[PDB]
Design a protein around this ligand. Structure first.
Ligand SMILES: NC(=O)c1ccc[n+]([C@@H]2O[C@H](COP(=O)([O-])OP(=O)(O)OC[C@H]3O[C@@H](n4cnc5c(N)ncnc54)[C@H](O)[C@@H]3O)[C@@H](O)[C@H]2O)c1
Ligand SMILES: NC(=O)c1ccc[n+]([C@@H]2O[C@H](COP(=O)([O-])OP(=O)(O)OC[C@H]3O[C@@H](n4cnc5c(N)ncnc54)[C@H](O)[C@@H]3O)[C@@H](O)[C@H]2O)c1
Ligand SMILES: NC(=O)c1ccc[n+]([C@@H]2O[C@H](COP(=O)([O-])OP(=O)(O)OC[C@H]3O[C@@H](n4cnc5c(N)ncnc54)[C@H](O)[C@@H]3O)[C@@H](O)[C@H]2O)c1
Ligand SMILES: NC(=O)c1ccc[n+]([C@@H]2O[C@H](COP(=O)([O-])OP(=O)(O)OC[C@H]3O[C@@H](n4cnc5c(N)ncnc54)[C@H](O)[C@@H]3O)[C@@H](O)[C@H]2O)c1
Lengths: 331, 331, 331, 331
């Protein structure tokens, strides 16, 4: 019962480091490049620095302080040796198999459990650690999704605002660091905005993060939606939640409430703070959501809350977190 | 009856170019640097390119295609020769005399009318062209304020949402390009966030833009507030308006309504569009507010509207616009 | 005898606009995206602004102020209808057919002349307008290359330093804006440096620009090489030329010499200036090389010269310039 | 015999952290802001992260894990209580007292030794650890300078190229991250280039780093000069050294030579590497100079060498390093 990663990219590599630093052992790693490039990308990372440990590689492996790890370049899921490596849980992070209909291929090649690191489709269950994980059935579920980084920042907040003040309606905006899914200079893209130079523009882009948060929380079904603004930053994001509660409240109420959750039930997932912070202050923070108290606004029953989150490292800690759970309640 | 500029900086220089390209003649220009540096900053601009025309200078002047303009380096308002230059209307844009209590000094030195390009204090009237300009009394008013770039983007929108759907409550967020008021690297500032590296961070900062918009529109008094997020872009900004109307509406209603205003009463100030645009698409757009139709969201009576605006050039067109009005109804 | 473009990207689109604004008519445009995306990329450009004119499109065309232009999505050269469109000269700018061995396919499908906008291989002649264009034989040549933007900035300089002071040896460095060939965040690349986040790093990368300049100028064969440093800027570049002359000279000599060429023989290609400029000052400058006089250094016979150049617009003016020549001396 | 810092800015704060993590105790810290802002800038740093330890403050002090440190806001050197605090060695890093003629004021107020963290004037001795530190006379010297970050990167290299191949002439170029000395948007500056938007432009600026390196190494007197190019990066820089040796050599010779020095005599100051690195890979590297082997070029006796260096952290390690030496051989 070992882990495997398909899509050793931005998310893959972060999840790997976390799993490493936790003890979990990754048996195989598949991507589309030669193990040389994989070793160099793991070793030197532009956002989180050098890999804590020794990195080596040959035609068929990668070595992490000696321990070998199979590294393949198979672009067809069904053709990945998850079998002859004993890989049970797979972290599908290529961003191209976001639907069980296709990601099932990992099972019909060995794997016993598959975690899609992105908003999936036709999966067994989309889970947001801290919102609906206890709702995982090892018998029934086998193809999971860890939702999206935005969903993971919204959910812990919408949950607390529900079991305290109740939520009628909510619109949200997220100012998000760019990702490899955008373009460096104007170039073809299916989204005519993500096609524009990413480090030059503030780019408006759709996000199902909100509606998706309406599934892990049926409470907000059809009554929660949002927008996204890609901005010139390599990592780090903030969610702008504007929700109409079910009773007039004050910004100070809202906070002590989210603060409560932070230091109690949602501990480790949600965090609360009143410090004068900026983006670079939350980069590499494990949490899913970090509430900026001082920004909390409240005009009667119409509240506005802000939640910082590192769309890369934080999300990756949840993905690795999910692999632990799946392994603890394996099949 | 000629114009004068105090604070030949980012805003000053843009207002100058506009006034030039319109025919208006600036008699004197005061700042804190030698006329050499002034000539070089006007000539070569990093955002709007080279100055359309010939730029020269000597110990006492600047020359724009020959025509001389007095250029002084007097840091004390009362000591600026607005008198011996016949300067009637002054554009106070140093960002340091934002209150008539101090900006009055321009009058007790010559000037007959003073326009503060920023949220003023103790001024005669803060005006937002297209919202409450017809309310200018040349007899009573003499020290005006053109509000702020954010106010000028919000007002034209809040106005339309009032005379159509009525507004109960509204919270707004603005993702704003950085300004010379922030820091390049971490450095001392009265705001512990604007103190952080501006091209590196997404920086949360307070904005009275909303409450200020509650003055040009008493309708929203005490029921409109917002936040600001400084992001790594040199110019261009977007306002995120989340307002609770007085009746359930649809995003398509909201648009055709703002669109109406755009092509009618608020023409020239407000613009509406459905094109797939990004930040660099609105840089140097004269308008005060440009509605991004496609981003318009509506869950019943809770709406979310986005308005692009070039906090520099657009605002500067309003400032120059205000100088025309003041000159047309001079004293 | 009409023009055609294959690879309607960064360079393609700029060459198109130039050809348009010059009168030249492009008959067909091939790329890998739907004509919708092509129309949107031409219309709104993040660096050079909106396209001067009306842009429309349908399943089979693009319309520029009415005039229709065939727009296909054929990824196989031999399969492009250069025939049934009467396209004589083709601008191969996809960056994937940089060798006549493959780019010849444009001929065996219609075209009578092919211009490769990049360092080619197996081409008939690599030309650098102003250095060796008069050496074009319409009878023999049919597959040309316009070299590279770096080559086009170096050549006009190395030429002048040869026919004046003679050149023994020269090493050069270019600080170049990033290009679509690099990555937004760490990601797989054949060059383990261009694989790193482009807007975050200063990235060292090999450049054959120098050795290539040794072909258009056999004088420097085996005695000229250089390096390239990709830096966080979307467009604009500077070449750092360090050459050991054949006689001790002074910085003032070097300048008046390059200045001479600028205002004389190399006019229109090379420019000379002593103004205090920065990058944003040369963006969209047609020239191939713009000498920054004030930076000129000289310790005896070891000189250092700097040349600004807009790797996009300037190069594109040379590409369009080359299409004129090819058309003037067509086949 | 305790240390003191005047100018708790970018350099000051880094030197403080290093001195802290080394055990050295700073007695007093003077700047121009309230101890609140000082505590917040030390605590949260945009480039090097959170301060390793607890940070507190009151009207008269700062607390580092309890231990109190006097924090004043005296803009006049002679008026700093270096006396009633027993501060012997002062780190003058305000960037405004770069000449003993003025920095002497620290002595006539208490201090027994003053280190100017920048190219000084009228100082007793400018030292570059690893080049000419053993040449420090505690009896004669009392006002030192640690040179500049560029000087500290060049010197260790020029030294090795002298005691191996000899150096006839050398021109150098440095691509340097911006600093608080530049501007965020176009704004008045004595240097008409550093006046332009720093995160938007590649900015050419003079540097005495080379001539300065000609003092710590009289060998290159009048035969070494260079240029500087400020680029859009918050920290990290690379030096481009083009030197004409006294004998034809090969790039492989040059390297093994610099490599030798790196692992031997210049260990800890100079480093050598052949790894495929980019800027973000050297941020926070203690070294003064890190040679990028792979970039080494050599055409006979004309060589080109590149040296990475973190103009902030590395230089700060040298400054702290110098305070140790001064304390070990105190007065
Ligand atoms: N970037 C974020 O902050 C973030 C947050 C949450 C979820 N996600 C999701 O995680 C996924 C990966 O995101 P990323 O940021 O790492 O992007 P990425 O570009 O770094 O892609 C990951 C890796 O997948 C590899 N890949 C592509 N096709 C493949 C195939 N057929 N087989 C094997 N490997 C393949 C790519 O070469 C790349 O190295 C996406 O679906 C994304 O939406 C990203
Ligand atoms: N930046 C924007 O987008 C924007 C939009 C709306 C309003 N404003 C307001 O306009 C004002 C100026 O803004 P800016 O962006 O041009 O900033 P800026 O830094 O460019 O300042 C303008 C100029 O004022 C000069 N100055 C300072 N003190 C002076 C004095 N005592 N006498 C004469 N000149 C003096 C400065 O040297 C500078 O050149 C501010 O109050 C600002 O809040 C700015
Ligand atoms: N960027 C510069 O400054 C510059 C300067 C000089 C020369 N060049 C060269 O010009 C070429 C294009 O450069 P670019 O900057 O426009 O990059 P780009 O990414 O914008 O590529 C140009 C276009 O080619 C298209 N394309 C790719 N494969 C294709 C195919 N098989 N058929 C049709 N279209 C295809 C791409 O989709 C893209 O839209 C490269 O070879 C480059 O090295 C670039
Ligand atoms: N930035 C670098 O990489 C670097 C490298 C080597 C040397 N240096 C030199 O170190 C010095 C400081 O550089 P920096 O990058 O920290 O810049 P900085 O802007 O951060 O300035 C340092 C601090 O000095 C303070 N200061 C200014 N005048 C003062 C006064 N009269 N009394 C007390 N404090 C005062 C400023 O408020 C600031 O907080 C400069 O001379 C610089 O040239 C900088």
């Amino acid at each position: 019962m070992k882990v495997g990663i398909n899509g050793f990219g931005r998310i893959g590599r972060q999840v790997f480091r976390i799993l490493h630093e936790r003890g979990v052992e990754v048996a195989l790693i598949n991507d589309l490049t030669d193990n040389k490039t994989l070793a160099h990308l793991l070793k030197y990372d532009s956002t989180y620095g050098r890999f804590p440990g020794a990195v080596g590689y040959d035609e068929e492996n990668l070595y992490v302080d000696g321990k070998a790890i199979r590294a393949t370049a198979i672009k067809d899921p069904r053709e990945i040796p998850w079998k002859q490596a004993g890989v049970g849980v797979v972290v599908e992070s290529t961003g191209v198999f976001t639907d069980g209909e296709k990601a099932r291929a990992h099972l019909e090649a060995g794997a016993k459990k598959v975690i899609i690191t992105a908003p999936a489709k036709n999966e067994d269950i989309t889970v947001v650690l801290g919102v609906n994980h206890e709702q995982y059935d090892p018998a029934k579920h086998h193809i999971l999704s860890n939702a999206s980084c935005t969903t993971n920042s919204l959910a812990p907040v919408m949950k607390v605002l529900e079991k305290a003040f109740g939520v009628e309606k909510a619109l949200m905006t997220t100012v998000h660091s760019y990702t490899n899914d955008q373009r460096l200079l104007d170039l073809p893209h299916k989204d005519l905005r993500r096609a524009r130079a990413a480090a030059l523009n503030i780019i408006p882009t759709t996000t199902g993060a909100a509606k998706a948060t309406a599934l892990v929380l049926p409470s907000l079904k059809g009554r929660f939606d949002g927008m996204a603004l890609r901005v010139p930053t390599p990592t780090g994001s903030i969610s702008d939640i504007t929700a109409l509660l079910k009773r007039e409240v004050t910004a100070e109420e809202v906070n002590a409430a989210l603060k409560a959750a932070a230091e109690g039930p949602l501990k480790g997932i949600l965090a609360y703070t009143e410090d004068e912070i900026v983006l670079r202050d939350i980069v590499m923070d494990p949490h899913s959501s970090i509430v900026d108290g001082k920004l909390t606004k409240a005009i009667g029953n119409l509240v506005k809350v802000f939640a910082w989150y590192d769309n890369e490292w934080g999300y990756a800690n949840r993905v690795a977190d999910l692999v632990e759970l799946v392994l603890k309640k394996g099949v």
